[PDB]
Amino acid sequence: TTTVGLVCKDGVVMATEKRATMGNFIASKAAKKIYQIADRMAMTTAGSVGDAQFLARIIKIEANLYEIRRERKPTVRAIATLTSNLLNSYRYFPYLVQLLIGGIDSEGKSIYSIDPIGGAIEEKDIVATGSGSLTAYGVLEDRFTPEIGVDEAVELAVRAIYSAMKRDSASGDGIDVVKITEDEFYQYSPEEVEQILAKFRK
Amino acid sequence: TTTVGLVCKDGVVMATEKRATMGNFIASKAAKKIYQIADRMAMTTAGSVGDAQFLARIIKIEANLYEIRRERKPTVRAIATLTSNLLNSYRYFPYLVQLLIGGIDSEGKSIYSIDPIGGAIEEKDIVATGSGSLTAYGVLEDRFTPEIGVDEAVELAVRAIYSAMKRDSASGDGIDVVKITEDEFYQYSPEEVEQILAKFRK
Amino acid sequence: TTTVGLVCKDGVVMATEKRATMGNFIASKAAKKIYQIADRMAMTTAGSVGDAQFLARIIKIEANLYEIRRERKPTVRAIATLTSNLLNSYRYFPYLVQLLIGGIDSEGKSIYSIDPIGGAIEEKDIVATGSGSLTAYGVLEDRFTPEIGVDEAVELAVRAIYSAMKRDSASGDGIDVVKITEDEFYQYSPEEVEQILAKFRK
Amino acid sequence: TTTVGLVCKDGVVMATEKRATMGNFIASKAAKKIYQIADRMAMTTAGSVGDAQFLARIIKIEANLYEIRRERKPTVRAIATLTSNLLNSYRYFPYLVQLLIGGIDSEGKSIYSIDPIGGAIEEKDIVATGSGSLTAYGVLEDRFTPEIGVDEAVELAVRAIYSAMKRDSASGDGIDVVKITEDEFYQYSPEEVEQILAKFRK
Amino acid sequence: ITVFSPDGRLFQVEYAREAVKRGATAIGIKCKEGVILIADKRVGSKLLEADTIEKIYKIDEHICAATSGLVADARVLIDRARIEAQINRLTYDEPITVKELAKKICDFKQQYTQYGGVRPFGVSLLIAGVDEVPKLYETDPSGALLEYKATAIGMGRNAVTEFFEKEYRDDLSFDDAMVLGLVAMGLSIESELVPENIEVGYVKVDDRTFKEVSPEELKPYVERANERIRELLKK
Amino acid sequence: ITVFSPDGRLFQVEYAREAVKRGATAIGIKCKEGVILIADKRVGSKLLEADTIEKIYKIDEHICAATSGLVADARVLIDRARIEAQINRLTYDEPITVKELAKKICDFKQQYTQYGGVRPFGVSLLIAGVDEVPKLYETDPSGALLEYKATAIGMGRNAVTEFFEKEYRDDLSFDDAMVLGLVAMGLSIESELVPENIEVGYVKVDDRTFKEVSPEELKPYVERANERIRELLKK
Amino acid sequence: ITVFSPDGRLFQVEYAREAVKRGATAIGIKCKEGVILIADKRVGSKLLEADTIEKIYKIDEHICAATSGLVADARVLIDRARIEAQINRLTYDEPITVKELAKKICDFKQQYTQYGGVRPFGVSLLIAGVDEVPKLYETDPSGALLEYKATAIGMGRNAVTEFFEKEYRDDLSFDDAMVLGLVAMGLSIESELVPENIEVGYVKVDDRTFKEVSPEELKPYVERANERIRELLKK
Amino acid sequence: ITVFSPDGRLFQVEYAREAVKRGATAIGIKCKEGVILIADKRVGSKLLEADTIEKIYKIDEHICAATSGLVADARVLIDRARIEAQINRLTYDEPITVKELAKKICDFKQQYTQYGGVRPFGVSLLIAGVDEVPKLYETDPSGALLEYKATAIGMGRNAVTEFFEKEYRDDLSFDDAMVLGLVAMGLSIESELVPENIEVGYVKVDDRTFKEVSPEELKPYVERANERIRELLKK
Amino acid sequence: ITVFSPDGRLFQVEYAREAVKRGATAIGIKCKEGVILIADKRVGSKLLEADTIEKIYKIDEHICAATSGLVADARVLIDRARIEAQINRLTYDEPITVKELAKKICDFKQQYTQYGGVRPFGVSLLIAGVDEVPKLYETDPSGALLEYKATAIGMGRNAVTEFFEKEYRDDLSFDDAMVLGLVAMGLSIESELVPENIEVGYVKVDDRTFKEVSPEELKPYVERANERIRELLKK
């Protein structure tokens, strides 16, 4: 459990682990925990895995629903605030997940962190939930400067969750990353990320 | 987690601790536990962060709705009361917060504290609410006088909050302040506040 | 709480202890746990006097109603099953009172033991309930025959019940007994029974 | 409690102890624990005694109704599957009872066990169930042939329940037994079963 | 109640539309520089207070609507627009588009027309705002939606709409567009206007916030618009 | 029940207005110094104890309302109006305005006009109070909200309004206004009044409290009015 | 069911009033020293028992009611009144006053007017009591509630009201109010009463409780009235 | 509302079918490389903006559906299609097929025809889409569903269906197929098209994503079409 | 409203029956080797995609029904019959019998003519299958089921039945049965058959699996039937 997210001057990069365990039994290690909600808009999730993917599907269906219906793709803001409202209505039922929905929209770049009882907080800045987060956000803040490429942003996010990986293997050992550039929506998958961590040894 | 709020002779100035934690861990750079409800009304929350956010949004929507329907701008009492009856209707899905809603209307200046158990009480010119409040009352009330400028008051608010922050090992950094002067609803935000508290050192 | 119930060749007799085990507390001494449901049909209870008396009122009424509506005297099985459905419906409302409903009809004679969790067991000759169930039954077993007279059954029943009834001294004064012989729904009353069991001593 | 059920070349034979306790006390041994569902079909319960009684009446009433509605007797599987759905319908107030419902139809013979929380499995030849399963299955597996005849099976089926009920502290008070030979639906009764063990160690 | 006619029209929608027709005219004139939304106060006598009559209701904070028809039906549909407009801010944290709100209040009209336990509204609304470009809508009792660049509802509808086929232009100067809509209003009533027996609001492009013409500001526009109104009722 | 005509008017609304015509007259006269409300009890028989009869109903501490139409409809609407005024106080801790109280119950009337389950409330209510400045509204069966400043509902509407059309000045000290309103009532019924067969309430500017004017206190006004009433009915 | 006609009257309510007139009269006379409520329980057949049949039903201990119109409709309303008077004692631990009770069952009748799947109760009730001072009421099937000094419902309404218009006085001796009341009853039927076919109950001030005037104690009043019942038919 | 006719039809369906004839023609051409759906947004005034009025709606990411009949019903019916589509996608992670999408919205029209609580939706839709092969449906206001290769609903149905019977192939390639449906549209309105008076969408096979034809991209096809429309019309 | 005729018939049901007659003819024929079911894919234009018109629905793995009457109703009844069939499966883990499937949808159909709030079905189905002997049922719009040894519904109702009275031998083989039905169908529409204006499906006994005869295997049975259809339309 860690999510990191950073808002560059050339796009948006988010990262997450692939591995979250309940007990010593491994619930996933092949699940993506970054989902793509709308064309160039992602959702990243810290908490349990299960609720994260089921929830991302509803928010995706609703995002597609906003696009088709209103004749205009939804803002990052629109979908974050719509997830927040849903979470809050849904506090009788298991959707206690702390999510970072972010992307690009007509207003530029943003990532919102979404409180698990619903309640968005706008960031033009950087964020981590999780239990890997404590270390990662520290390392994240050290080499982040507001003049930053997404070329190096992917490196940094990998680096940050590598720090989280030292604690337990629960975080890291599989890591997803996304780069979003408003004309590319690239989800690296293990193999490529393995080479960006092959410059960091492990 | 404390809020102070003070009615000045020509406005309202109130402040909170920006400090928002999960453990003791700082997830984002900003998490404003101060909301603008109406054009010259605030809502400061001492207690939970996420529950506050969503709840503020409701009240805020209703303050706008009020204005549009009645062709009259809400008074401080109106929003403040509206919130009490709201909390009480919605105790089935309780928000565990001690708010302070105050600011400025045609009628003049006032700040009300609102329970989730309900009831909006009015505080004459000083109020402190939170775990840090007992410490806050101390600093606030020595140097508060019934005649105090808005400018003299901002110095006092930051000071009243600051006394708590050094005391806790789960606080230290972050400040909210809003001077509401009857022309402006200025939200000073971290940078500007910082030079206010580089006159009281550490 | 001891109940006996036995099907003769020529009568049906059942007995109970006057009050249940309530602790050292007592309320009245015109309390009874033996009620008349239909003309020649009784209900004896193991459990609370209050729970037994209320439910008995509902059953007596439905029995009376059955009788009227189909111009046929209800048979004991008809009431025992009727009472089975009331209990199963009310298994999450407090009626853990466990009933022996027996007496006399056109189809013959029985005693049916009816449970909070439903069904009805036709007891073909000897039946007890309670905490005094094992003690009281053993006394019965001893002199029971399928040819026992109505009075011998009365003499048997009072001795048998009196043995388990030794356990409580704030219920060993008074005894419930009933004769069902198709001509008498006789309920003896304390005084007339008491000279019988002077001989088995107080 | 212990059940068996034997599938045969000439029938279905099933057996269970007749211990039926209410509270935890044996009121009387004037009970059954084999209930007749259809013309040539039985239900034997392992689990709590209370649940089994009323539940037999319901399953049964539905089976005479199916015979009436469809002009054709139900199959072994139809009743067993119904009992599965029946259990799952009232699972807000659940009945915890493991019913072995089996008997005879045109398709041949079979015994289906149904679990209180879900589906109905077929048991190929041999089925047993209860806290006495472990011994009772132990008798079966060292003497069962698949060319086992109906009278032979009654002797084997008794021996399984006999051996099992001695060991447990929750099982005894005679053996109930049933032969379903599609010419008779014979229930051996206390009288007869007692003689099959009096060829043993009584 | 609501059933199809042998023409395949709704008897009750056509009757609802005539209901609009005996209302009181409104008018909306659009430009690239804002959208002007004007509605005619009813003054029948001098006992009618005429400083506190609603004819231009503000719905959301950059979307206003004017009305004609049954003022009772209309307010309730307007209150409903205001709740829907704020429900958008609650669930998406962004104001409703001028189109988006328009559809949503017409769902409300359309549901009533179809159910036989209730009758359609006998109101038409003009909903005008700026979501990022000026918009002006006209909704019909059926719940039909038509974007427009100039429009009128009410009694003056026919007069004004015909009028806009000559005068209206695609781009206009806001000060021009404002005056052109007072001229139209003047024409339809068949008399000079007085600043306090007409209502005017506007969403401008620069403000993106509904504002409403105070009587004094209005004053010069009535005066310039009176000269052309005079020319027209001579020819 | 309620459907539109080929002429666009809801038959039920139009007929509810005939009920209002068929009712005992009230009246509102608002000046700068506060707002008065006068209602005719009449006659009765001489067995009617018509000095206990309400027709002026206090809704809120600073609001009263009068009525004409169906008595039954009137009373029920007034009980909802009173509930509404206190519900505002429950939820916003501030008294309801005169407009929002009048508005809320007109929305409630509009609910009973569109639904075919019910027939309309056949009542006109005058809502008068001083909430932030004297305001006197008149409500109509449909929920037509119109603000007046001197008005009449009931059997006396045609007469009393023509009276107010020449005579109403906006200036008026409170006494000149009460005498004005009383004269108007007198012309309708075509005779001199009895202060016991009329009931006068008022909400004042200076008190901002409702008081109902008892026959003792009303006495000097009546005397100065019966003078004028007799005079004008000889012209 | 219930619809307005162009004459502004709910036709079903006007038909209910005709139902009242076809019922058996009751009458109430009010004095300073209590209120008396007399009702005709007169039977048409010999086999019909006139020793038990109510036309004066006790509501609360301070309140009584009489009735005219459809006995079935009445009996449901009166049972409602009995419950309603008792609901007051639950929640405020005081006895309901006469106005609030009559008003409450009237608010109930008014609902059944305006509810489209159910029809107006066809009944007028005379609710008499002494809550502090004497009160007498007449309700109507409309929901109309009017306080009267002396009145009738039913057959006798036109005759008896008229009769009171001359003979009733504002104050009377209880004993005189009683004879006057029974005279009015005899004039209406145009025959002499017997005690065995009228019911007279009251609520007195001094007692503050309801008692019912036993046939033995009815007797002397009926004989005293008999002389005048003839006198007025020889006039 | 809806019941059988003595001729074994349903009145409300038949009059609804007439509602479609009284609408604005639309029209679909299915070829092997896509399905093209062109609708007539040909306007009634010059102040009706013909560049922000919509009559071809996207329903999913490979389905678009055009409409004729009543505007209001259509919008709502299609909104139901958009939710039903996405609901499918939610439950099965597979995008809803044209046929099956059409079946659920036909069930919905059928519910409103079936049941006596509500009147039918008076619209015909053409649902166009490539599920995995190009599919073109016609939906009728009863809830009937028919697969066509080329079809029309609305005003132009008579002209357009007759035209395809005289010119249409199935080895018709995409460009020629676009011109066919634009030519056919021209015949409906008995004039040459204008690119601002029609909206065109197509789900292609190769893309398998709906993309709308631009006003820019309309122009090559309008030019070609016009040579063939003029030739036919001037004969 | 569905009420009684003074002839003991339901009218809505008689009217529904004519809707069944005016529908698209199907037809089932049973032999002791399985049961066939043929339904005419009806085409009015060359622009119907006729290969995709469903007129024989599969309902379980051994049950199929074709239909005649109103197409909208027909589907929902069939969608109903599909869930119902499966529900039997879900609770008893048997297949539903063909008779019981027919009962259960006919019990549904009855509700729709029991309640006067909603309209009847106007669809008849031919539900054919193999429970454990072949079956064929004709359901009625009342909701009543009759077992037929070979029958039709629709416009061929009398033509097909008449034919079967003479031709039907009982005691038939499948290949004969196949052709026999085809003749009966070709005579319904009174012309010669092509395989692509009929859809044909069957449940064999010796497999108990449903199959739809693709036009490839269909063509040989047609060819034999075109000889007999010709013979008969030339006598």
mmCIF file of C-alpha atoms in Angstrom, chain H residues 14-213:
data_model
loop_
_atom_site.group_PDB
_atom_site.id
_atom_site.type_symbol
_atom_site.label_atom_id
_atom_site.label_comp_id
_atom_site.label_asym_id
_atom_site.label_seq_id
_atom_site.Cartn_x
_atom_site.Cartn_y
_atom_site.Cartn_z
ATOM 1 C CA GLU H 14 -51.521 4.252 -33.700
ATOM 2 C CA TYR H 15 -51.884 7.922 -32.920
ATOM 3 C CA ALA H 16 -48.252 7.713 -31.599
ATOM 4 C CA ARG H 17 -47.198 6.196 -34.940
ATOM 5 C CA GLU H 18 -48.790 9.406 -36.442
ATOM 6 C CA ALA H 19 -46.669 11.472 -34.059
ATOM 7 C CA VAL H 20 -43.635 10.017 -35.867
ATOM 8 C CA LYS H 21 -45.024 10.842 -39.288
ATOM 9 C CA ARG H 22 -45.516 14.459 -38.104
ATOM 10 C CA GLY H 23 -41.729 14.669 -36.999
ATOM 11 C CA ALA H 24 -38.543 15.618 -38.770
ATOM 12 C CA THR H 25 -37.223 12.953 -41.167
ATOM 13 C CA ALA H 26 -34.200 11.017 -40.381
ATOM 14 C CA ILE H 27 -32.631 8.238 -42.255
ATOM 15 C CA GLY H 28 -29.914 5.581 -42.125
ATOM 16 C CA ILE H 29 -27.821 3.914 -44.896
ATOM 17 C CA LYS H 30 -25.992 0.741 -43.910
ATOM 18 C CA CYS H 31 -23.067 -0.315 -46.098
ATOM 19 C CA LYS H 32 -20.491 -3.096 -45.335
ATOM 20 C CA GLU H 33 -17.899 -0.557 -44.004
ATOM 21 C CA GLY H 34 -20.039 1.355 -41.500
ATOM 22 C CA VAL H 35 -23.504 2.600 -40.823
ATOM 23 C CA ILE H 36 -24.247 6.197 -41.581
ATOM 24 C CA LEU H 37 -27.074 8.091 -39.826
ATOM 25 C CA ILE H 38 -27.986 11.474 -41.119
ATOM 26 C CA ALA H 39 -30.742 13.585 -39.535
ATOM 27 C CA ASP H 40 -32.691 16.613 -40.702
ATOM 28 C CA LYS H 41 -32.118 19.611 -38.443
ATOM 29 C CA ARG H 42 -33.535 21.862 -41.102
ATOM 30 C CA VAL H 43 -34.710 24.876 -39.215
ATOM 31 C CA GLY H 44 -37.889 26.999 -39.194
ATOM 32 C CA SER H 45 -36.328 30.468 -38.492
ATOM 33 C CA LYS H 46 -32.914 32.114 -38.970
ATOM 34 C CA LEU H 47 -32.662 32.997 -35.308
ATOM 35 C CA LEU H 48 -32.827 29.158 -34.540
ATOM 36 C CA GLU H 49 -29.192 28.301 -34.272
ATOM 37 C CA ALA H 50 -28.541 25.411 -36.559
ATOM 38 C CA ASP H 51 -25.053 24.776 -35.208
ATOM 39 C CA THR H 52 -25.816 23.864 -31.603
ATOM 40 C CA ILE H 53 -29.152 21.952 -32.189
ATOM 41 C CA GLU H 54 -28.613 18.120 -31.938
ATOM 42 C CA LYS H 55 -30.846 15.435 -33.532
ATOM 43 C CA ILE H 56 -28.200 12.543 -33.852
ATOM 44 C CA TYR H 57 -27.221 11.458 -30.344
ATOM 45 C CA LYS H 58 -24.308 9.248 -29.341
ATOM 46 C CA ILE H 59 -25.370 6.421 -27.139
ATOM 47 C CA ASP H 60 -22.292 4.503 -26.638
ATOM 48 C CA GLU H 61 -18.778 4.546 -28.100
ATOM 49 C CA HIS H 62 -19.865 2.677 -31.314
ATOM 50 C CA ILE H 63 -23.623 3.371 -31.251
ATOM 51 C CA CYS H 64 -25.367 6.561 -32.329
ATOM 52 C CA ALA H 65 -29.172 6.867 -32.597
ATOM 53 C CA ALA H 66 -31.309 9.474 -34.526
ATOM 54 C CA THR H 67 -34.930 10.288 -33.789
ATOM 55 C CA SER H 68 -38.240 11.530 -35.253
ATOM 56 C CA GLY H 69 -41.484 12.183 -33.403
ATOM 57 C CA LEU H 70 -41.764 14.348 -30.361
ATOM 58 C CA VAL H 71 -38.468 16.042 -29.402
ATOM 59 C CA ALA H 72 -39.041 15.777 -25.617
ATOM 60 C CA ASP H 73 -39.809 11.963 -25.549
ATOM 61 C CA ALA H 74 -36.831 11.317 -27.700
ATOM 62 C CA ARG H 75 -34.402 13.019 -25.558
ATOM 63 C CA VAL H 76 -35.570 11.125 -22.478
ATOM 64 C CA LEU H 77 -35.802 7.757 -24.392
ATOM 65 C CA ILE H 78 -32.283 8.189 -25.611
ATOM 66 C CA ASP H 79 -31.115 9.159 -22.069
ATOM 67 C CA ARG H 80 -32.520 5.837 -20.901
ATOM 68 C CA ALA H 81 -30.558 4.199 -23.837
ATOM 69 C CA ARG H 82 -27.338 5.902 -22.647
ATOM 70 C CA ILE H 83 -27.819 4.716 -19.006
ATOM 71 C CA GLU H 84 -28.914 1.136 -20.230
ATOM 72 C CA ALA H 85 -25.873 0.976 -22.435
ATOM 73 C CA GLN H 86 -23.444 1.893 -19.709
ATOM 74 C CA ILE H 87 -25.251 -0.323 -17.240
ATOM 75 C CA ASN H 88 -24.589 -3.193 -19.635
ATOM 76 C CA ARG H 89 -20.918 -2.213 -19.809
ATOM 77 C CA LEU H 90 -20.743 -2.066 -16.032
ATOM 78 C CA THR H 91 -22.219 -5.487 -15.399
ATOM 79 C CA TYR H 92 -20.473 -7.332 -18.171
ATOM 80 C CA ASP H 93 -17.346 -5.361 -19.158
ATOM 81 C CA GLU H 94 -18.517 -5.807 -22.805
ATOM 82 C CA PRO H 95 -19.973 -2.815 -24.821
ATOM 83 C CA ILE H 96 -23.769 -3.223 -25.419
ATOM 84 C CA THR H 97 -24.693 -4.568 -28.905
ATOM 85 C CA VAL H 98 -27.007 -2.630 -31.153
ATOM 86 C CA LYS H 99 -29.757 -5.241 -31.184
ATOM 87 C CA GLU H 100 -29.805 -5.846 -27.524
ATOM 88 C CA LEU H 101 -29.605 -2.089 -26.701
ATOM 89 C CA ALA H 102 -32.545 -1.593 -28.939
ATOM 90 C CA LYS H 103 -34.438 -4.446 -27.230
ATOM 91 C CA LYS H 104 -34.168 -2.853 -23.722
ATOM 92 C CA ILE H 105 -35.354 0.616 -24.877
ATOM 93 C CA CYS H 106 -38.137 -1.136 -26.874
ATOM 94 C CA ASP H 107 -39.155 -2.891 -23.665
ATOM 95 C CA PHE H 108 -39.318 0.540 -22.015
ATOM 96 C CA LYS H 109 -41.589 1.965 -24.743
ATOM 97 C CA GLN H 110 -43.614 -1.148 -24.478
ATOM 98 C CA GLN H 111 -43.908 -0.716 -20.640
ATOM 99 C CA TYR H 112 -45.390 2.717 -21.222
ATOM 100 C CA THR H 113 -47.808 1.411 -23.862
ATOM 101 C CA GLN H 114 -48.690 -1.745 -21.807
ATOM 102 C CA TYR H 115 -49.567 -0.110 -18.637
ATOM 103 C CA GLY H 116 -52.401 2.234 -18.042
ATOM 104 C CA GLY H 117 -50.560 4.600 -15.667
ATOM 105 C CA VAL H 118 -48.706 6.604 -18.419
ATOM 106 C CA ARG H 119 -49.035 7.350 -22.118
ATOM 107 C CA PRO H 120 -46.665 5.801 -24.767
ATOM 108 C CA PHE H 121 -43.389 7.448 -25.805
ATOM 109 C CA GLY H 122 -44.211 9.049 -29.152
ATOM 110 C CA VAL H 123 -40.998 8.590 -31.006
ATOM 111 C CA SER H 124 -39.367 6.230 -33.519
ATOM 112 C CA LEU H 125 -35.575 6.005 -33.248
ATOM 113 C CA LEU H 126 -33.090 4.599 -35.661
ATOM 114 C CA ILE H 127 -30.421 2.925 -33.631
ATOM 115 C CA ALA H 128 -27.200 2.623 -35.724
ATOM 116 C CA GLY H 129 -24.060 0.927 -34.621
ATOM 117 C CA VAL H 130 -21.555 -1.735 -35.326
ATOM 118 C CA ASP H 131 -21.694 -4.401 -32.720
ATOM 119 C CA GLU H 132 -19.299 -6.435 -34.605
ATOM 120 C CA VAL H 133 -20.872 -5.960 -37.998
ATOM 121 C CA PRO H 134 -22.903 -2.913 -39.023
ATOM 122 C CA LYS H 135 -26.437 -3.024 -37.792
ATOM 123 C CA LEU H 136 -29.270 -0.639 -38.366
ATOM 124 C CA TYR H 137 -32.487 -0.832 -36.468
ATOM 125 C CA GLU H 138 -35.696 0.938 -36.594
ATOM 126 C CA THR H 139 -37.591 1.259 -33.262
ATOM 127 C CA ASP H 140 -41.341 2.098 -33.452
ATOM 128 C CA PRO H 141 -43.430 3.786 -30.567
ATOM 129 C CA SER H 142 -45.101 0.493 -29.614
ATOM 130 C CA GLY H 143 -41.726 -1.037 -28.785
ATOM 131 C CA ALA H 144 -41.249 -2.839 -32.108
ATOM 132 C CA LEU H 145 -37.849 -3.537 -33.526
ATOM 133 C CA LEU H 146 -36.965 -4.226 -37.245
ATOM 134 C CA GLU H 147 -33.539 -4.513 -38.841
ATOM 135 C CA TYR H 148 -33.221 -2.514 -42.046
ATOM 136 C CA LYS H 149 -30.409 -1.975 -44.526
ATOM 137 C CA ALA H 150 -31.614 1.490 -45.221
ATOM 138 C CA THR H 151 -34.642 3.166 -43.762
ATOM 139 C CA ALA H 152 -36.278 6.440 -42.602
ATOM 140 C CA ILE H 153 -38.626 7.522 -39.947
ATOM 141 C CA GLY H 154 -40.573 10.750 -40.016
ATOM 142 C CA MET H 155 -41.801 13.061 -42.823
ATOM 143 C CA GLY H 156 -39.601 11.606 -45.504
ATOM 144 C CA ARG H 157 -40.377 7.957 -44.909
ATOM 145 C CA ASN H 158 -42.674 7.622 -47.955
ATOM 146 C CA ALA H 159 -40.038 9.207 -50.383
ATOM 147 C CA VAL H 160 -36.996 7.732 -48.930
ATOM 148 C CA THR H 161 -38.026 3.984 -48.636
ATOM 149 C CA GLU H 162 -39.351 4.160 -52.218
ATOM 150 C CA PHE H 163 -35.949 5.695 -53.353
ATOM 151 C CA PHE H 164 -33.887 2.776 -51.883
ATOM 152 C CA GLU H 165 -36.066 0.286 -53.610
ATOM 153 C CA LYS H 166 -34.996 2.092 -56.914
ATOM 154 C CA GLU H 167 -31.294 2.610 -55.907
ATOM 155 C CA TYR H 168 -29.394 0.958 -53.227
ATOM 156 C CA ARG H 169 -27.033 -1.908 -53.336
ATOM 157 C CA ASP H 170 -25.223 -4.024 -50.724
ATOM 158 C CA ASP H 171 -21.798 -3.891 -52.398
ATOM 159 C CA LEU H 172 -22.375 -0.083 -52.003
ATOM 160 C CA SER H 173 -19.111 1.292 -50.765
ATOM 161 C CA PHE H 174 -18.716 3.893 -48.060
ATOM 162 C CA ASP H 175 -18.347 7.131 -50.098
ATOM 163 C CA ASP H 176 -21.169 6.339 -52.469
ATOM 164 C CA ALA H 177 -23.292 5.223 -49.473
ATOM 165 C CA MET H 178 -22.791 8.631 -47.778
ATOM 166 C CA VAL H 179 -23.854 10.413 -50.890
ATOM 167 C CA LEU H 180 -26.981 8.107 -51.185
ATOM 168 C CA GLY H 181 -28.344 9.062 -47.811
ATOM 169 C CA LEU H 182 -27.515 12.772 -48.358
ATOM 170 C CA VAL H 183 -29.245 12.527 -51.882
ATOM 171 C CA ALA H 184 -32.235 10.815 -50.262
ATOM 172 C CA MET H 185 -32.399 13.512 -47.568
ATOM 173 C CA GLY H 186 -32.518 16.107 -50.394
ATOM 174 C CA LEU H 187 -35.524 14.479 -51.892
ATOM 175 C CA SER H 188 -37.429 14.522 -48.579
ATOM 176 C CA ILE H 189 -37.270 18.300 -48.246
ATOM 177 C CA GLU H 190 -37.534 18.825 -52.013
ATOM 178 C CA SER H 191 -34.414 21.053 -52.039
ATOM 179 C CA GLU H 192 -30.581 20.832 -52.143
ATOM 180 C CA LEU H 193 -28.948 20.346 -48.880
ATOM 181 C CA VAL H 194 -27.078 22.927 -46.930
ATOM 182 C CA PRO H 195 -24.283 21.560 -44.697
ATOM 183 C CA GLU H 196 -25.769 23.649 -41.751
ATOM 184 C CA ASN H 197 -29.230 21.868 -42.141
ATOM 185 C CA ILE H 198 -28.206 18.287 -41.526
ATOM 186 C CA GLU H 199 -26.071 16.441 -38.920
ATOM 187 C CA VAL H 200 -24.293 13.258 -39.818
ATOM 188 C CA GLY H 201 -22.686 10.605 -37.739
ATOM 189 C CA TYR H 202 -21.326 7.230 -38.606
ATOM 190 C CA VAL H 203 -19.971 4.332 -36.717
ATOM 191 C CA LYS H 204 -17.266 3.033 -38.831
ATOM 192 C CA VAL H 205 -16.220 -0.700 -38.958
ATOM 193 C CA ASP H 206 -12.442 0.010 -39.084
ATOM 194 C CA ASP H 207 -12.450 2.529 -36.242
ATOM 195 C CA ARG H 208 -15.319 0.846 -34.367
ATOM 196 C CA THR H 209 -15.834 4.253 -32.788
ATOM 197 C CA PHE H 210 -18.363 6.678 -33.664
ATOM 198 C CA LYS H 211 -16.958 9.929 -34.995
ATOM 199 C CA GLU H 212 -19.256 12.767 -36.256
ATOM 200 C CA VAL H 213 -18.960 14.238 -39.636
#
